[PDB]
């Protein structure tokens, strides 16, 4: 009888624990496996996958497709803001129930640098440019277009290319940032302005719309996971 | 590591000075024993291990611990993870503006009965659950709720009569160490919450009874005990003087610099 | 021939020649400089406006009587109203700087006094009453000194600093100070003092509004003693120059 | 018949051995960290070129 | 199953014991170091930094600076005693507060050499010299200067330079001693006295001022880590 | 594949990109660039944001009518209120740089107009 | 793959194996005496010599 003292942490029952277990079904025959396409090693390929975003979320359009689509229309005068949302990928209702949004709310950390996408839906003969803004917080969502300048900007023309893409880049004086909504660790801002006004010839319609997209881009990463407050319950289904 | 020693010395008589300097240059001076006097040479086998950093952070502490019952108002207790509500542990980690060290839990959880008149009350082994929230999780707001299932949160299940129960979690920071000190807002406009309450968020920890247990009520208690380990240490500062107040802010109430004695020349204590 | 009594500090424009002085504390040995692409974290690439930054600044020089307590300024906000030190503070969301700290106190041969110069990273001050926190406007004053109080303060409802300088604020002991960098000047050897300090934070790098994250305190332990019809008035003069900055993410202009 | 391997660290080895015959009833596997993420994103027979136009 | 017998100690929670326990958040990822000014891989390296000491404790003024104040005054006759303060660096009220006293007070066992550091503040023209010693136990602090000289005395001038260093020696028939009073390792004595009365010009002040320091020397080592009794509590902070 | 159509222009952290344009007139053939230590005068050090000053600004857009005889801008002060070009003009008694101009009109292919770009240096009215 | 090093003693080897896949599953290193006084003591930029006047 070799001599032994046990531990404090016997006879537990730990969630995440790894430890082996004796088999309840011995020499069990396991089928063979199949090569089955789109096989996924790891989420991160999930995650730079384009998805729509529900970036017009006023009133109770949300319960109709217009929630993913963003109004821009001829005006009078240059300088007007098309839109804006604040990034936080994981609280934020904009982001919320996107793709990128899901994968995150079972992480608590992150890092990386969000893609993106734009695309004009808009007439073929219709043109125009656009401002796309970031500003890094430290003061409040810039309201004038001269104040828009002052970030990191992609000025982004229509033409026989459709697809923009806007990269926003990793700044923040830590390596990851909460996902859950912290003052501290706050992400930042984003606009888009208009660059020059729509311009229509006649019997093209005049209002068009515009599409956006986000992705992880290979430098993203994820970590601590945890439980998703969205999917609730009251008693066992049945 | 060793002790260094003392080398022996006869008489000197000689312009240059050991015994002289100038502590105006913020330097302290090296001098060893050796140089104002005459010495012997002499072996020391002391050892410096015990003041090492490792063996001065490294000792399980009680932090903290709560009551909850098995019926009635409150059937769970809830605590936000922060060091600074136990005074003795507290302290340790006030010399060392940046520490780094990795955790190793020990809860020890009790139980005790209450005063009632039920009659045929029969125990039965109590089962204690504890989970682990991280920051922004759903929060139970009731035993039976939902969220007790830990599809996911790292939760664990105990049993009264077995060995105290102990997990080691890994360095959680989100910059490159801890911070115990930060002087600063956490609103870019100077407002809000002031001091270092803002760097922390840490999630929730929770535990509750799995099973009734009995007709008659009982009340338990839980205790947690950190453990630090691989520690690592940067820019020392002097210890805490006045006693502590509240566990959000360093706020103190002014306390004289020592004890007092008798007049300057009295060699005891009064 | 040579001497240690003198010294002569050269960054950018400015120059400050001293002849009594002592060594050159550095910071905790490590000699400031730039960030290694090791630890980076930003992916835009850094200003670096060197010349037009590092150089020496005078912020407001404080009178210095028998009863006076002492003083502390708040270092990554002092100079923000100053050059462009305090403009390319307010247009970018981080920074990284280390700071080398002159003080300047002459008397003649027959003034005693003895003055402490320490450089305390993340002083963080406590409260009037337990419950309440500082104001940002009490702990902080544009390139003005912030001065202690001998006696303690009453705890009113207010959001008052809490003064007393055998606390020093921090609710430590004062005497215990020296274990950050310090120099002593001192009216008999001395005419000024020297430190240099990297730069010392939690993550490697900041916003400079936020965080305040190096404090300097200057306590007088032996008060200004004289015979009369010596000259009453000798002021301290503090000079405060960045060494190595850099910045990243330009944004928008203001505070908010 | 042991087997040795290296640890998660971040700025060491372990040993572990399968006590039983059933594969089953071996240890998770955490440290397979193979991705290769043309699968998902750029699914075109066309290989397209990032300096490029798309359409041209 | 491999014959096993515990032993006693089993399923016990040792406070300082060294075990092994399994993860709770496998692979989490760690962020990696930092190079921060100012690395302390043991506290010895604390130990060494000089400090002040309030070295008069008189009545009501240590709630003022002037507890760290030493006065020194012109007298009319030579070998009044400046000051003196028992060493018991973990006990005595001198000590206590003190930077070294702090470490100790974690420590029941010490031995080293403790250097006191002496600095004159006086005015720049008056000058004058000190007697430091140190008598070893056996006899009351010595009453008389005659008597203090046949401790271990330096004898000490002030001048061009400013700082002095008193070296205590270690001598004590152990190797180490108590850092709680008791009274068969009590340590010794200190005094100061008046070499040559302070001589001053006319027109420079009478009275000066002179600060102590105290620091461990390389010698210095610890023992037996334990609570420290000054920090007080009542109920949970909140 | 590529085309003379398309451009993409990267300064610091703005970025332009046209989908019709033509090839960039360059100065008369000499590439902006910092100053040779032969032609120095100021003895001083030079300071020298880069990112922090180069990149693009857009000033104020301006509506064109069928009547609207012209526009005339001038560089050395137009920035001097934006940005730290604006701060750092403030501060220093000297400067030297150069400029690039990117002037955008977008219209349908129904639109008929002509528009003439010219950078005129030392215009004196 | 096991390990050997010596105990603390005064006037020996013990055998130790890291059991689990996390670094911070593995015991507290106590033996760590590393020790460099100069950042503290000594923090000045001209060398200071023991031997000589401080300020010449
Ligand atoms: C059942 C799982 C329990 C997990 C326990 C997690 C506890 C986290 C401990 C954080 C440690 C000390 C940190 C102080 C935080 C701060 O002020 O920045």
Redesign the interface.
Known sequence: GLPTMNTPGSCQFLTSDDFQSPSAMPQYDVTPEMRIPGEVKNLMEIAEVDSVVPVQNVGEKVNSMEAYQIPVRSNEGSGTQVFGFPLQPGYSSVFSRTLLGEILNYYTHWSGSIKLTFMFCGSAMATGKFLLAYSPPGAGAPTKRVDAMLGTHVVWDVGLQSSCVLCIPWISQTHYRYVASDEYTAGGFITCWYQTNIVVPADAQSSCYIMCFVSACNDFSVRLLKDTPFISQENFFQ | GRVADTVGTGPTNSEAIPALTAAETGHTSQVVPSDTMQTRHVKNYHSRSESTIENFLCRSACVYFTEYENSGAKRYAEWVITPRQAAQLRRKLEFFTYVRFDLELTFVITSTQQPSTTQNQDAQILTHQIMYVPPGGPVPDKVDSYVWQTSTNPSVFWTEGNAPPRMSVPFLSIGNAYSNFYDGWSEFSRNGVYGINTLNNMGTLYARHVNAGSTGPIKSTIRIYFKPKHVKAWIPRPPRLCQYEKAKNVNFQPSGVTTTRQSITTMTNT | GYSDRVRSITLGNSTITTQECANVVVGYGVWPDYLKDSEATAEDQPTQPDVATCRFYTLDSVQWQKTSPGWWWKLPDALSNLGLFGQNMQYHYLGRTGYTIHVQCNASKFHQGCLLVVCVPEAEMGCATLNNTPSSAELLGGDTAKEFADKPVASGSNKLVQRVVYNAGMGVGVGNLTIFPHQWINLRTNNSATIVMPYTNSVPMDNMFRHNNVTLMVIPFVPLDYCPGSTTYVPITVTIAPMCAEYNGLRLAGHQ | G?Q??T?????????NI???????????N????????S???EPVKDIMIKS?????
Do not use: E, W
């Open positions: 042991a040795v391997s640890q998660k660290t971040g700025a060491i080895h372990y040993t399968n006590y039983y015959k059933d594969a089953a009833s071996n240890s998770a955490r440290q397979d960290f193979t991705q290769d993420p699968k998902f994103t490029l136009p798309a359409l041209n």
